[model samples]
Target: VNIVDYSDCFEGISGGAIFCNTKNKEYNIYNKELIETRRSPCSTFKIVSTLIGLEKGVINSKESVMGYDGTDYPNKNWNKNLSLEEAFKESCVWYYKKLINKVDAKSVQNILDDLKYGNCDISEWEGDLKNGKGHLNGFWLESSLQISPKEQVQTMAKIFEGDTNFKKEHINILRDIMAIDVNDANINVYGKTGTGFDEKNKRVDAWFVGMLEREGDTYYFAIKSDDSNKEITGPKVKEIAINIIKKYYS
Candidate 1:
């Protein structure tokens, strides 16, 4: 079958997507060059970050709430105390800042290396250290780590296929947190979105990476978009990715 052109969903965005069917190893990609180019993981790193945190016991199913650090962020959701699930849903950066701090840098690096994640470079161990605050700019931010859309899908497929050494229990918990309600029993979706500020052109760099389960078959996808506005975020790009799936997939 000829690949479908999902460009309509990306109307004004400058980016592409990659999708893989785990059962058949079938792949459909848009803008192959863009999907293959590495860019900062931004918040999508949470997919692996959450997994690492769960595996290291820094946070668990029930005891995942973190206190507010008293700094007023624009996002009201991030202003209050948040559980791990809440943090994941809200894409709360503060909660993860604390969680990652509690986990050793080397241990986090180990999981990244294990997953062959992105460039596997966390060289900026002392993030924002020069600013007198240790947790401000993490390596996974627009700082150091980068991953391509293709690699993002590849990594998720591996995780979902139990190809990694992580415990099934931890992955199960991750799925629970990642679940996105589509109101369709047969089309289950789990994903994470990452947002970044593209300083060079004052644009928004965003990512939506996830796995979709339909009829016992799993699909891995990653969509990365660059928009010419500050208001553009992961949710905006996520809508684009979902639109493509809704139109192309049953």
Candidate 2:
């Protein structure tokens, strides 16, 4: 798959990269250096988090529910109890934080190591105000966990093909929750978005990583946008993916 031209889709982002890979094919779409550069996985890390949670038995199933305390959340939608599906859709931070606590650092680290995730580093984390808890619980938010765009696409592809150590059931749950409707009867798209900031607390990275199934062919993709001043968000990365899909994948 040729991704070279897709760089146009990142027009407004200060700096970023997009990577697309097939089972046996390879191509470059943006700065090679940037594509290889590692950065916080952001909420995109949730995909791995979900898998770890399920594999570790911390989360029973997509229907597994976690009650929300009365604590006021930055996103009003997260103020109530949510299932794994609901939390994934809303990118609920608190729910995952609580779930992460249950899964524990050792298990998370072990999973990442087994999966060969980017740098496989989760040694430290930072706090985030928007997530309602200024603690290291939300490590993917501009914290120690880092992955490059190319690696992200590779990871997504691995998950799509069940190439990792995760059981079939756990991978299935991940695929189910990551599902996003592209409204194309012939195509099914599943994706997760991630957003994070720089050291100065400025929004600098937005990520959309997922797999697209068309007919019997599967394509994995990761789109990232970085802007120091402007807030690059998950929705924006999703929009970029949609545009690329319409222009080429269709």
Candidate 3:
């Protein structure tokens, strides 16, 4: 097992953690309690909505589209008329939110319960829109849902081994959604990037989560930080992950 400080690996990036597990190796840093700190899931929650749509037959093909109305919803801004594949690629909130609201919180909660993901409470708040706190609020802004890095590594193992609750086709669709082919012959990697408001730091908490597969074995990785630096874009995040992947696993 390899456990090291975030400072050592990512140039003193703050509040970040990476957990890696392969067929014969495992490693993680940070203590158990700290690892469970739950912030907004950002785009990472798209996987849940995508899987639900697939399982419920709401979406027949990865390429199917729900038209974008070009209206700016209060909670999110999104593109108009997006195919499911395009939605995933663009991180279109409308597409995912349309599916999620149709499914409703109860049904979605049931799905999460079955998967043993986070707290199952789905209540709503009836306060000022500016400062309201409710179940949907929890679902949206501060859903006390927490997952340790240890559990993340384990869940990612299942995802890579194709042992998820999602149907085979659904998993394949997501795999395609997360994949990026930059014409690099030495590495083939799949990943997703996320960002959300970090209330404590008054900045955005950036996240990159996914895996690298080599010769049929996979290593799951994640990086979390509240850095407002301009250089930390999607490509840079992937570069950081790839560097770690090549260093230890390749």
Candidate 4:
């Protein structure tokens, strides 16, 4: 139940929150209300998306490759073909968009409902693409789908502990895809980052959600920051999260 000071890490940000829980410990959250408030999950939804994709057979395996059609994208790395692991690591939106289409809405919605995901609403939106590309595939963007930082941590814990009804193979594939090495011998971290605009389209919310493993112990965490003037992206949140993990949890 260590509470890490994030004031310096979130300097210059409008507001931010972090929720952490382990097997023996309960939640240690900063800005408690923010953790309870639901917001668009952005790319962090990919964690759930990947699991659903694998379960639905939309993705053959963790190594299943999807060709990039050269659509104009924010990240140049995403312009090339990528496997599930590569797409997850690069946070390639296009890859997941295609994967979602293959899985279809009904299957995705059913899985979300079963998991009791944030609000459990995957309804479509008919507005300008301010947050993400496409209409039907952008449900987790600035759309109907929303989840709180608290829910993020809980869901991640379920995934890590294999508490969900998903098949063992599906869970294994998800665990492999979400792995992010911190270059430390004792610590193994698996997580995802998300960045998207607030409802007003004025503020940017950055998120880093995942689990940390050390000495057979697991700690699940979710951290989010909202910045109005500055651009807060996934990498920014990842940096803060990594520092906190190394300093406090490691």
What's the TM-score of each model vs. the native?
Answer: 0.90, 0.89, 0.78, 0.88
Q: lDDT per residue, candidate 1, 1-250, as tens digits?
A: 1254678888777878888997787898888888888878888988888888888888877348767768888898888878888898888878888888888878988888888788987887544345454556788877667788888998998898999998898889889988898666778888888888866567667989998988878889999887677777898888888888778875
Write down the lDDT of every candidate, Cα atoms only: 0.82, 0.77, 0.61, 0.77
TM-score order of candidates, best first? 1, 2, 4, 3
Stretches of candidate 2 above 4 Å error?
1-3, 15-21, 125-133, 200-203
Q: For residues 128-238, could you state the per-residue lDDT of candidate 4 as single tens digits?
A: 365454433477877788898888888887776878888888887888878887989788888888888776767777889888888977778888887775567878888
Residue 105 shift from truth in candidate 1, angstroms? 2.0
lDDT of 2 by residue, 18-55 (tens): 64546557654666666777888888888988888888
lDDT of 4: 0.77
Candidate 3 TM-score, C-alpha based: 0.78
Better of 2 and 3 by TM-score: 2
Clashes in each model (backbone N, CA, C under 3 Å)?
0, 0, 4, 0
Task: Give the C-alpha miss distance for residue 178 in model 2, angstroms.
Answer: 0.9
Ten contiguous residues minimizing lDDT sum, candidate 2: 127-136
Index of the highest-TM-score prediction = 1
Better of 3 and 4 by lDDT: 4
Tell me each candidate's RMSD, in Å, in order: 2.5, 2.6, 4.1, 2.5
lDDT ranking from best candidate downward: 1, 4, 2, 3
Local distance difference test, candidate 3: 0.61
Error of 4 at 88 (Å): 1.4
lDDT (10s digit) by residue, model 3, range 123-192:
5311113445322233533334544444555566676577766788788887887887745566667777
